[PDB]
Structure formats: C-alpha cells, structure tokens
C-alpha cells in the first residue's frame, strides 16, 4: 500500500490495473463512465445552473456476453474482465432528452495484454456494434490499443531442433527445423498434438519430425487476429451509415485501432496520443536508417488534426468526453427519431445583428454565431453559443460545425474569406525535402476544402441525420495546374454525391456580400436533390457563370465597347484613337456595371433558380419557420410512405397538402407548422384510416 | 465547292458543319455512329476473321424529343439539330451479344454555339440519361464542349444610358445606368418588357428609368445554365450507380463538361484534348501575371491520365471509340442481366505457365495475361489477350483491368512488385517550386494506390456489375510521416467501403511468392462482406500480423535467443560473450525461420481464415469452376429473393442447396454448376410453385 494515511481508500491499490492505466497516460477503462457522469452534469450546469440533479439522471451498466454469447447487463467489480474489450450501456437524462437517452461505450482495456486485439475482443466489439445498430442507439468507441495481438507457438520454442549442415561449425548453415520423438510426445502429453504439422524422415539412424508449419495451441497469434480486425473494420464501415459513431483516442491507437478511428469517421484525439500504423522504430528498421524520432511524428495531432482524420483535439480524457457529450447534444436519441429541439435564451424571434460589409474583412464564424464588441454582443444567424465547429484543424477555407436555429439542430457549412495558410512538413525520409507553406485564396475551392465539404455533408447525413445549411460563397474551383494535378475534379464530384445521398432538409443560401460562380454553383444546385434541396440568395449576393470581369472579356469586347462610345460620347461621334485612350477606363467600368446588373438575386428569382430572395437581418426568422415547416412536412411524408407503399414524393406531398384546410396558405411556413403541430393526432387518425389496403 | 473534281461528293461541303468540326480537331457529331460501326466490325474481325458481316449487324437511330418532350427515333439529315446536344440509340450484334445489345450515345455538337450547355441541351442530356437508366442500357457520353452557355441581354446593349457625375468630363465617374421613355417603348414594342427591372425617377426634367436588374429576353445567359448544369451533374452521379457510364473527351471539355467526365467515372481522353475548369488565359488575368501557357498544361493527358481522372488515352477519336467498344465487351447488355460469357481459343482446361520466382523480378501482368518468350507463349491465369488494363497512367503500384477466365468476364487487381516513380510537376504559379520525383516501394499501399484500389472496386461494381479477383500481395500501408499526413488512412478506409458495397462474387488470392501483412490483410478480409467474399492463399504465399523480422523483434528477443543457444549449442551450455558473438548471426536466421513457419497457408487453412490453400499452376481450373458455380448459385439466390420476400442469405442458399440431389457434393463446383445448368427450367418450376404466398 502506497501511499499510507490517505483520508479515503487508495483506488490505484484496490485495483492495481487503475495504476497501470495511469502510468500509460490514460484513464482506467472502468473510470470512463464517471467521466461521462461528470460531463453530463456539466451539460446541465451550462444549460440551467439552477437544476437540482440527482444520481438517477445517469446510469451506466456494463455489458458482457452471457453463456450463449448474448450481451447482458452486469454489476461487478472493475478489472474482472476476462477479455481486453469492455462495454457499457449508458442511460442519461440530458437537456435535449430530459426523460433519458441511450448509447453504448466500447473501449479497449490498455491493461489487458497491452490493449491488443485478439479474436475475442474482435468478436465482442462486433457484438456491441450490432447491439447498438439493432437498437439504433449511438456507438462511442474509446481507443487505447496496441493493434492486432501478435504471438508465437511458445510451446515449440523449447522443443524445436535444428538440422545443421555441419554440427561442429554452426555458422556453416542449417537445412530445416525438427522435433524428436521426445518433442512429439511432450506435445501429445499436453494435448498440443495440433501445434505443429510434421513430416517424418530418418537421418543417420535418428527419426526426425520435420516442422513444415507451426500452428500453435494458443488462439490469437496471427492471421485469426487479422480476420477479426477485418470483421470489426467492416462492422464499423456499416455502423457509420446506420448509427451515430464517434471515437476518442486516449493513449495510442495502432493498426486496426487507427482504421477503426477513421471508419467511425467522427474522431477526437487527445494531445500526445498517436494514431499510427507501423511505429517509428519498426519503420527505421525497415528503412535501415534512423529516419523517425517518435510515433507522434507519424500520428500525433500535428498530423491527424491537420489531416482531418481527427475532427477535434482534447487537452485530456475528460475534455474529450465533454466534446463527445456536446457533439451528441445535436444528434437524435436513436436512428430515425426526430432531431433534438433545444430552445435556449436566444429565441428565433429577433433580427441578425452581425452583417458583413464589402470594404471590411470578417470572420464567417461571426455571421454564424455572432461576435462580442465593446458596444455589446452582435447576434449572428444561429443561437448564441450553439456553434460547435468540427474538422477545425484541416482545410480551414471551409468552416464546418453544428448549430441551433431557435432550438433546431443542424449542420452548418460556411466559407472562410481570409487567405488560408497550411504548413506541409518536410519528409524525414527525403534528405532533399523542405517544409512548404501553401497559401490558398479565400472563396476558392481547393482539393482539401472540397474534400472537407463532401465529408461534412456525409457526416451530417449518416448517423447525425441532421438538416443542413450551406452559406454558399465560392468564386469557383482552383483550375490551376497544381490543383488540377491534385485531382480537384474528384473532390468536387464527391460534393455532388454527398448531396444526392442527403435524406434531411437542405438550405443553400448565398449570403450578403456573397457570390456563387461557375463550377461552385453546379456542385451545390438544388436539382442535384430536388426532394431535399432549396436555394436562396440574399439581395446583396451575386451569381453568374463568370464574374463581371470575365463576362466583359468574353461578351462586351473592344468593338462592342467602341460602338457604345459612338452611341454615348458626343465627342467620339486619326483624331479618335486619342478620345478612345481617354474614355476606355470609364467605359471599362460601365461594361463591368452592365454585366454586374445580370448577377442580381432579382434575375435568380425571375429565372426560377432560387426559392426566394432574402434580407440577411430577416433570415433567422425566415429560416426558423421554413425548417420547422419542412421538418413537419418530412415527418408526414414518412408516415405516408408506410401507408400507400408506392407513390412519388410529389404524390405524397400533394396528398398531405390536400389535408390542410382551404384557408391555410401552403406558402406560409409558420401557419403550416402551427396547423400540423395542432393536428398530429388528428393526422394520425387520417393515416390510420388509409390502412384500407389490398 | 472546294475541292472540285473529286470521285464522290464532298461531304464537308454538303454539310459545312462537318468542316467546322474538323477545323476544331474533332469528328463531326453525326459521323460518330459510323466510328461505332467501324469499331464493332473490327471487334468481329479480331474475334473470328471468317465472319461474314452485313449492315443489319449495326443500327444507329437518332433520338429527338417529340411535341410532348418524349424521346423518339428519327431518320433525318445530319445538322438539322435545333439544340447543341445529340443522341443515338445503337443496336449492335457483337461477339458477346450476337443477337444484339443496346446503348445510347449522347454528344455535344461542337458546331452548335461552340458546344456550350444551354438549358435545352441540359434538359435533353438529362432526358437521355433517364431513358438509358429506365432501360438499364449503357450511356456513352462524347464530350466536345465550351461548358455552360454565357450571355448578356444584347437588346439592352444599344438602349442603356449612363447618369454621369459631370457630362463634360466622363472620367469624373457615373452614378447608375438607365433607360429613356424611348428605350422603354423600344422594349415594349418587341414584347421585351420583362428584359429589365426599372425604377422611375425625374432628374432635372428628364424622366429616367433606373436599371436595377438586367434579366434579358434570350434564355440561357447565366444562372439558368448553372441550374441546368447542376441537374445534369446530379443525373450523372445517379446514372454511375445504375448503368454503365463511359465518356470520350474529343475536343476540349470545359466546366460542367469536366465534371461530367468525372461524374460518369469511366473516361478515355484523346491526346491533345484538354479537360479544364477555368482556362489558362482567364487564370492569367486573375493572377495578374503570365503564369500558364496553354489549356493542355491545366487539363491535358499529362494531368488527367496521370491523375486517374482519365482511365485511358486515345491517339484519335476512332481509337477512343474502339476502346469504349472493347471496354463494353466485358459488361452486361443491360442492368441485372448476367455478365457476358465469351469463350475464345484459350479454354479453361490448361495449367498456368508463367510462375513467379523469389530470386527474379517479374511484371504482374505476366501472371495475369502471360508473356511471350523465345521458347513460346507462357500462358497466365487469365484468357490470352483478354487483359484490358484501365487507370494505367495513375498510381502504377496497383494494376487494374478487366479479363476473362475461360470466358467469364471479371475485374482484376494485381500488385506491381517493381518500385514505381511519379513525376510531380513544378507549379507554374510558384517561383520557388521545382518538379519532384517520388519513389514508391513495391507491395506497399500508398495514398494514391489505395485510392486506385477503392476506385477500381467501385468501378467494377457499379454499372459493370462484374465479379472480382484481387491477387493480394501487399506488405502493408506506408506508415511514414509524409504518407500519414497525406491521409493514407482515408484511402485505405475507402477500400473497406467499396468491398462492403460489392454485389457480385469476390475472390481474394495471395499468389505464389506473395504476402499479405498487418493493415493490408485487415482491409481486404472476407468478413468485410461474407456474402460475396472468399479468400485463398497459394502454398507459396505468406501472411501474418508482421513479417518474420518484426515477429522476431517483438516475440523472439535477446533473452529467448540466448536460452535457445543454451539449449542447442553444446559449447554455450566472461568466456560466453565470445560464443554469443559467433552464434548470433545464425541464431538470428533460426529465429527468422521459426517465425516464417507460422506464416504458411497451412496455418491459414487450420485457423479457418482462407477457404482453401491452392497451387498456382492449378488456379485457372479451380477459379473457373468456382466462379461458374458461384455465378449459378447467385442467380438462384436472386430468384429466391423475389419469392419468399423475407429471409437471410444463409436461409436462401441452404434452401437452394436442399434442392440439389443427395448425390451432389455441395463442395464440387463443377458438379454443382453442371447440375444447375442442366436444370434451370426445372428449378424455374420449383420457384414458380413457391408462389403459394400470403
Ligand atoms: C488560384 C485561384 C485564385 C482565384 C481563383 C478564382 C476563380 C474564380 C473565377 C476566375 C475567373 N472567372 C472570371 O470571371 C474571370 C475573371 C475574374 C476576375 C478577374 C479577371 C477575370 C478574367 C476572366 C477572363 C475570362 C473569363 C473569366 C474571367 C470566373 C471566376 C477561379 C480560380 C481561382 N484560382
Ligand atoms: C516506405 C515503406 C517501405 C516499406 C514498408 C513496408 C511495410 C511493411 C511492414 C514493415 C514492418 N513490419 C515488420 O514485420 C518489421 C520489419 C520488417 C522488415 C524489416 C525490419 C522490420 C522490423 C520490424 C520491427 C518491429 C516490428 C515490425 C518490423 C511489418 C511489415 C510498411 C511500411 C513501409 N513503408
């Protein structure tokens, strides 16, 4: 017992595995539920400081496999796990789900065979994934591992013999490895007959059993660990499309551990905990040179967070738990349940304070969440303090996060107007390699930013099942040689694919001072997904194939411009080339203005390419009711889908809208939502009466 | 008429648009069906030189929209197209489909408004896509365009007026643009009242109509072209997952044209025809410096083919047509129809001649298709001359293509054992940028090669609907700093996703001299998709978590090795450190051999991680019947799916296998296929009798 004379018992002594975990710079597996209780309690204090919270608000129940491999709940002492993988079913009353929400926590036990993955950990991890998926509840994975388990048939180690070329000189070589009758019997005696594959021969009187394959008695030495890893990689790939999947990296995550981090997509990395494949030491041995310094050089946050593999970093395990808890506050309690409405002090019914100007540089986050000033807080489009930014360390040209719109949770994509710099590090493996600083123009899609956009869209759709708003403001894609070679077309195409797959309301809104040109429009147009998509443009937005400078260059050339001088200039209508020189700069300006006049939201409305033209200060009020209306209608489309079984979206919506009283304006979002909410149970009777099916 | 006195009529004069197309370095749209006839005829000559072919073997029928926008067939003169998009329905008797196969060809008319995309071309392209998708037939797109159409309200050009700050000095500035009552009436007179959005004011007696927005009378000037582009981008994204989509780039492909190339995935680029977004000239104007030289520098084959955006290059339009024709020979006639069996001179019933050795470097293509030698042709695993390689210019570490196995078409993925070099060009935009040569070790997955692998898997699955064989031979993923920063984990994860989505038989086979370690195994394991996947390892293959050098480093350390010297060396059993120095090199070799003995196919079989261990020379015969058996069983699973409506794969297969006579060995592939083929109609009666449903 160390230390003696403490006020309460030494938990690290009561369970020494707690101390092993601590010595490896991580929380002990069995202590993680407590971090979830601490975080859930903080969630309440930050929401309503006055809430009197008891212990029944949070329940953690360890899951273990029964006699038939069926998962059941247990109340046992920490450290009684016979396998290196552990899981808990958590039932917590949160501000979004005050009656309770459920999720599973799977975790490696770093103190059980170094957190390595053997077939039993793999089988259990897969069974927990399936348990969560069947129930539709989120699956949190806590990664603290050594990757697949590695072994040797340690029983053949003291038994094997070597058939030397010349016994007197061992360095002259050897022919094969073998077992004697003594070795063969030793295995027979311990029922380890299946440990080797032998072939009998007689060499100079001696009966030797030539080892042809070493199998081993102990399960979990090689290929079976790779099979199991594959199973859990496929399991996680499938779970990402089905339930909310998140992973917290606490202590190393190696090999399968690294793929699991990525396969679950959503990841929080604790500072100083690497995400690696082959470690630095092993790589140096392969390269035959001392190339790398640490595993952190290969998979630290300066790699993974900058990569976009790590969505967020965490200062310590509790910080990471707190971030999982916060991320989950935006996500339905289970698959196909409505998005969690959380109304705060920031009511839907106010104008937007922060407005961008053309002459002044701004941070797009100010338009999203607002900004503090000396005169006071300038509210943004979304609920004060609801902007939870993710992928913040990668492709900083796009801003992605979750937010709330008068309570409604949604995914937000904004455009960083400021030039973004990235520091591509020097390759240690190449002596003729130096670090390079890459500057990327604002409002221009690059391979990395287009990749981040598609990724964000997918991550909002799968598991999160959130509506989305893209505050669309791009000049186009980078068409230069470097960016074209770096496959910009591939990443731009992923955006289209992500939108095609989207299953919740989408809102594309070109903000004030905003623009959407050429390929940038193409890739985000509501016809990619007419069922979910909708486009809006601010009265101060611009959009066209080209920008006024390009439109002019192609369509208002020198001849057209001189004919304009002949029409408009009394002096112009040998001596003329002189007036031409004087007029051209202002005439260039006239043509730029002529072009710009086609790029207005009024032409967008007239040409029916946007649902409505909007006023920024009035967007919070508009978007709130539009999304609230749309969430109600989507619910009714889904209930109708079960009934009829076969009909188009248009047929379903037309039918739902035919149930609205004659007095209801189908174009009034506030009225339509108000009516639906006043009649959910009356609409339920309507749908139940429709069960007149054959 | 130029030239005079020709033997037959001057086609370029009869239709001058043919000459315009020619002057732009491309085939005239209406001449493309003839290239398809020429190619289809070549297909026959290369298959059976003795075939007497007539003209009814090939039928091309132009599709045009009727009065109600419904596509119908027409026989009209070339060049009567009122829109810049043209389509043909082709019905061709090919060696795979001798009774005929159908597909649509959509193409831009480079001679119609520079091949630009207006709303009518977009609406038609979408209608053709839908026509092909509804029918399940392939959609070939021939790209020769200027991207979205760009315009201005050319009627406002001679009418507009400018409100000068001071009329005497024009360069002092202007306030706004306006129309006079004369201008307003001019528009009123031509029913172009809707061309502008004005606001009346009176300035110093004059009634001016302030232009607030220029809309225009002519459709297809701006945003409506971007809407249409979006529609066709989404349409193509959807078509790739539904039907076989291929694109041939003949003459430039700009903006939406470039995205269409990528969205359809499968692309052949004609040498010298660029795939661009913003052109070089425009980019130089944005950058304010003469950075780029040509559009080919941005989107030529040295970009797109090296990128993997272009799957193949073509020397001229006929070469590209011939490659589409050849690619299609592997693809079903329509969606959900069986893969086209084409048996050639190379019967299934022979051993594999080309066998790799450990001491000799080989080209993996030799194992796939065989190789010519002085002694004669060494046959490979697949049918002689059936290897059609794709993505050949990108990530050369993986070899991807289509092949035939005794007639059966399938996707093939092999590993390039030789070190691959890539030349990353110097960025013209960066003066402190030089070209870099990147060497990539063989049998190691890098970001690019992992991306190519996932891509190939997807491209085989979607549209092609082909079975697959991965000749798995990777040491692992590159875990170094550069490759980890370049997101190797993301691309490795795409492999898993591509396999999860796979709907046709998969065969993973570790070939002779081959290996599969750590993360390389994880990502390709049959548990990712138990329904389709199956693993095999050659008797000369190796597989484990680590390689013998790593296994030794971790599990057979210094102490274990000295205890082994104490056991095995009579001399070893101050003076001992000397014998230790002498013994260690051979003892290191003993430990390397001890490890290697666990890495055998026999342990893989014993641990149940492979379906069977195989002998390479006998693989063609094994794989032929295994795939032929599996194609027959898959067919029966599908017919059963319609009947019962609800049951697992295992329940379906167990039921199908219960119909086999008692004498049939379920493990004999040749017998099982022979029985199914002898009883398709008897099995059809069985399934029809199962329609006893309520
Ligand atoms: C590295 C980098 C930096 C900024 C970029 C900006 C864009 C947006 C494009 C630029 C080109 N473009 C234009 O309207 C445009 C121009 C836009 C601004 C200035 C000059 C322009 C000249 C053009 C000449 C012909 C056609 C178009 C021109 C459409 C919008 C596209 C790619 C960019 N790449
Ligand atoms: C740039 C590059 C080049 C080759 C690469 C090869 C691999 C394959 C790996 C290499 C590491 N590995 C080993 O079995 C291995 C070793 C393999 C060969 C030589 C030395 C090794 C030392 C190791 C020390 C500890 C653990 C493993 C070691 C598993 C297989 C992985 C990454 C590679 N990256």
Short mmCIF file of N, CA, C and O and ligand atoms in Angstrom, two decimals, chain A residues 278-279 281-287 292 429, chain B residues 439-446 474-480 483 515 517-518 544-551 553-554, ligand 2:
data_model
loop_
_atom_site.label_atom_id
_atom_site.label_comp_id
_atom_site.label_asym_id
_atom_site.label_seq_id
_atom_site.Cartn_x
_atom_site.Cartn_y
_atom_site.Cartn_z
N UNK A 278 2.44 1.32 -38.83
CA UNK A 278 3.74 0.81 -38.37
C UNK A 278 4.43 1.91 -37.58
O UNK A 278 4.53 3.04 -38.08
N UNK A 279 4.87 1.61 -36.35
CA UNK A 279 5.54 2.58 -35.49
C UNK A 279 6.88 3.05 -36.02
O UNK A 279 7.49 2.39 -36.87
N UNK A 281 9.97 3.19 -34.73
CA UNK A 281 11.10 2.27 -34.50
C UNK A 281 11.14 1.19 -35.57
O UNK A 281 12.18 1.01 -36.19
N UNK A 282 9.99 0.52 -35.84
CA UNK A 282 9.86 -0.51 -36.88
C UNK A 282 10.22 0.05 -38.26
O UNK A 282 10.99 -0.58 -38.99
N UNK A 283 9.69 1.24 -38.60
CA UNK A 283 9.96 1.91 -39.87
C UNK A 283 11.44 2.21 -40.08
O UNK A 283 11.96 2.01 -41.19
N UNK A 284 12.12 2.63 -38.99
CA UNK A 284 13.55 2.91 -39.05
C UNK A 284 14.33 1.65 -39.38
O UNK A 284 15.25 1.71 -40.20
N UNK A 285 13.91 0.50 -38.81
CA UNK A 285 14.48 -0.83 -39.05
C UNK A 285 14.25 -1.28 -40.51
O UNK A 285 15.16 -1.82 -41.10
N UNK A 286 13.11 -0.96 -41.10
CA UNK A 286 12.79 -1.27 -42.50
C UNK A 286 13.65 -0.39 -43.44
O UNK A 286 14.25 -0.90 -44.38
N UNK A 287 13.70 0.92 -43.16
CA UNK A 287 14.44 1.90 -43.96
C UNK A 287 15.98 1.75 -43.80
O UNK A 287 16.73 2.26 -44.65
N UNK A 292 12.90 8.38 -38.32
CA UNK A 292 11.90 8.94 -37.42
C UNK A 292 12.37 9.05 -35.97
O UNK A 292 13.31 8.36 -35.58
N UNK A 429 12.22 11.14 -44.43
CA UNK A 429 12.71 10.08 -45.30
C UNK A 429 13.44 10.63 -46.53
O UNK A 429 14.20 9.90 -47.16
N UNK B 439 9.49 8.20 -55.37
CA UNK B 439 9.67 6.77 -55.49
C UNK B 439 8.78 6.11 -54.47
O UNK B 439 8.69 6.55 -53.32
N UNK B 440 8.10 5.05 -54.89
CA UNK B 440 7.23 4.29 -54.01
C UNK B 440 7.60 2.82 -54.08
O UNK B 440 7.55 2.21 -55.18
N UNK B 441 7.98 2.25 -52.92
CA UNK B 441 8.31 0.84 -52.75
C UNK B 441 7.18 -0.04 -53.30
O UNK B 441 6.00 0.33 -53.23
N UNK B 442 7.55 -1.17 -53.88
CA UNK B 442 6.59 -2.13 -54.40
C UNK B 442 5.97 -2.89 -53.25
O UNK B 442 6.55 -2.97 -52.16
N UNK B 443 4.77 -3.44 -53.48
CA UNK B 443 4.00 -4.21 -52.50
C UNK B 443 3.63 -3.43 -51.22
O UNK B 443 3.37 -4.05 -50.19
N UNK B 444 3.65 -2.07 -51.29
CA UNK B 444 3.30 -1.16 -50.17
C UNK B 444 2.20 -0.22 -50.65
O UNK B 444 2.38 0.41 -51.69
N UNK B 445 1.06 -0.15 -49.92
CA UNK B 445 -0.04 0.73 -50.27
C UNK B 445 0.30 2.15 -49.85
O UNK B 445 0.70 2.40 -48.70
N UNK B 446 0.13 3.07 -50.80
CA UNK B 446 0.35 4.49 -50.59
C UNK B 446 -1.01 5.18 -50.77
O UNK B 446 -1.96 4.56 -51.27
N UNK B 474 0.40 -7.34 -50.66
CA UNK B 474 0.88 -6.11 -50.05
C UNK B 474 1.50 -6.38 -48.69
O UNK B 474 0.94 -7.16 -47.91
N UNK B 475 2.63 -5.71 -48.41
CA UNK B 475 3.35 -5.78 -47.13
C UNK B 475 2.62 -4.97 -46.06
O UNK B 475 2.74 -5.25 -44.86
N UNK B 476 1.89 -3.95 -46.49
CA UNK B 476 1.11 -3.07 -45.64
C UNK B 476 0.89 -1.71 -46.27
O UNK B 476 1.06 -1.53 -47.47
N UNK B 477 0.51 -0.74 -45.44
CA UNK B 477 0.32 0.63 -45.86
C UNK B 477 1.57 1.36 -45.46
O UNK B 477 2.20 0.97 -44.49
N UNK B 478 1.91 2.43 -46.16
CA UNK B 478 3.03 3.31 -45.81
C UNK B 478 2.64 4.12 -44.56
O UNK B 478 1.73 4.93 -44.62
N UNK B 479 3.26 3.83 -43.43
CA UNK B 479 3.01 4.47 -42.15
C UNK B 479 3.92 5.64 -41.83
O UNK B 479 3.88 6.18 -40.71
N UNK B 480 4.73 6.05 -42.80
CA UNK B 480 5.64 7.17 -42.65
C UNK B 480 4.93 8.50 -42.47
O UNK B 480 3.72 8.61 -42.72
N UNK B 483 3.26 10.08 -45.91
CA UNK B 483 2.08 9.30 -46.29
C UNK B 483 0.93 9.33 -45.29
O UNK B 483 -0.23 9.26 -45.69
N UNK B 515 2.59 -12.07 -50.43
CA UNK B 515 2.44 -11.85 -48.99
C UNK B 515 1.31 -10.90 -48.65
O UNK B 515 0.94 -10.06 -49.46
N UNK B 517 0.27 -8.74 -45.09
CA UNK B 517 0.58 -8.45 -43.67
C UNK B 517 -0.27 -7.34 -43.12
O UNK B 517 -0.79 -6.54 -43.90
N UNK B 518 -0.31 -7.26 -41.78
CA UNK B 518 -0.99 -6.24 -40.99
C UNK B 518 -2.21 -5.61 -41.62
O UNK B 518 -3.13 -6.33 -42.04
N UNK B 544 0.88 -12.90 -42.06
CA UNK B 544 0.93 -12.72 -40.62
C UNK B 544 0.76 -11.25 -40.26
O UNK B 544 0.76 -10.40 -41.16
N UNK B 545 0.63 -10.93 -38.95
CA UNK B 545 0.49 -9.54 -38.48
C UNK B 545 1.71 -8.75 -38.97
O UNK B 545 1.56 -7.75 -39.67
N UNK B 546 2.91 -9.26 -38.65
CA UNK B 546 4.20 -8.70 -39.04
C UNK B 546 4.89 -9.67 -39.98
O UNK B 546 4.37 -10.76 -40.25
N UNK B 547 6.07 -9.29 -40.47
CA UNK B 547 6.93 -10.14 -41.29
C UNK B 547 7.88 -10.85 -40.30
O UNK B 547 8.02 -10.38 -39.17
N UNK B 548 8.54 -11.98 -40.68
CA UNK B 548 9.46 -12.65 -39.72
C UNK B 548 10.43 -11.75 -38.97
O UNK B 548 10.70 -12.03 -37.80
N UNK B 549 10.91 -10.64 -39.60
CA UNK B 549 11.83 -9.72 -38.95
C UNK B 549 11.20 -8.97 -37.76
O UNK B 549 11.86 -8.78 -36.73
N UNK B 550 9.93 -8.61 -37.90
CA UNK B 550 9.14 -7.93 -36.87
C UNK B 550 8.71 -8.86 -35.76
O UNK B 550 8.81 -8.48 -34.58
N UNK B 551 8.22 -10.08 -36.13
CA UNK B 551 7.78 -11.13 -35.20
C UNK B 551 8.93 -11.43 -34.21
O UNK B 551 8.73 -11.46 -33.00
N UNK B 553 11.70 -9.45 -33.64
CA UNK B 553 11.97 -8.23 -32.89
C UNK B 553 11.07 -8.09 -31.65
O UNK B 553 11.55 -7.70 -30.58
N UNK B 554 9.79 -8.44 -31.78
CA UNK B 554 8.81 -8.33 -30.71
C UNK B 554 8.72 -9.56 -29.80
O UNK B 554 8.71 -9.39 -28.58
C1 LIG C 2 8.29 3.32 -47.15
C2 LIG C 2 7.91 1.96 -46.71
C3 LIG C 2 8.61 0.91 -47.26
C4 LIG C 2 8.29 -0.37 -46.87
C5 LIG C 2 7.29 -0.54 -45.94
C6 LIG C 2 6.98 -1.83 -45.58
C7 LIG C 2 5.98 -2.06 -44.67
C8 LIG C 2 5.66 -3.46 -44.29
C9 LIG C 2 5.81 -3.69 -42.81
C10 LIG C 2 7.17 -3.26 -42.28
C11 LIG C 2 7.26 -3.52 -40.79
N1 LIG C 2 6.85 -4.87 -40.46
C12 LIG C 2 7.72 -5.83 -39.93
O1 LIG C 2 7.49 -7.03 -39.78
C13 LIG C 2 9.03 -5.35 -39.41
C14 LIG C 2 10.17 -5.37 -40.18
C15 LIG C 2 10.14 -5.77 -41.50
C16 LIG C 2 11.30 -5.81 -42.24
C17 LIG C 2 12.50 -5.41 -41.69
C18 LIG C 2 12.53 -4.97 -40.38
C19 LIG C 2 11.37 -4.96 -39.63
C20 LIG C 2 11.44 -4.56 -38.31
C21 LIG C 2 10.30 -4.55 -37.56
C22 LIG C 2 10.38 -4.17 -36.24
C23 LIG C 2 9.24 -4.18 -35.47
C24 LIG C 2 8.01 -4.55 -35.99
C25 LIG C 2 7.93 -4.92 -37.32
C26 LIG C 2 9.08 -4.93 -38.09
C27 LIG C 2 5.56 -5.30 -40.95
C28 LIG C 2 5.51 -5.14 -42.46
C29 LIG C 2 5.30 -0.97 -44.14
C30 LIG C 2 5.62 0.32 -44.50
C31 LIG C 2 6.63 0.56 -45.41
N2 LIG C 2 6.94 1.82 -45.79
#
